[PDB]
Amino acid sequence: GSSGSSGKRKTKEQLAILKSFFLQCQWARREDYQKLEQITGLPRPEIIQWFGDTRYALKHGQLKWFRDNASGPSSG
């Protein structure tokens, strides 16, 4: 449970840095979040929660940037 603070006012720029994270790790730790608040400039509580909601949409298939590969990379 958490206080009644509802806020999702984010900027494409800030979110951009997140979208990249979610992909690398659908879930972030307390040691990683601290960093996100330095690249996105958004409160830890604002980022932590974000990741949660992100999972929902994805599971349903809302995200348009996720699993949106374009090319087929590889290595010999």
Curated annotation (Swiss-Prot):
Source organism phylogeny: Eukaryota, Metazoa, Chordata, Craniata, Vertebrata
Tissue specificity remark: Ubiquitous. Strongly expressed in adult testis and kidney as well as fetal lung and kidney.
Coiled-coil region(s): none
DNA-binding region: 8-62
Subunit-structure text: Homodimer or heterodimer (Potential). Interacts with HOXC8.
Name the UniProt record assigns to this protein: Homeobox and leucine zipper protein Homez
Compartmental location: Nucleus
Highest taxon in the source lineage: Eukaryota
General function of this protein: May function as a transcriptional regulator.
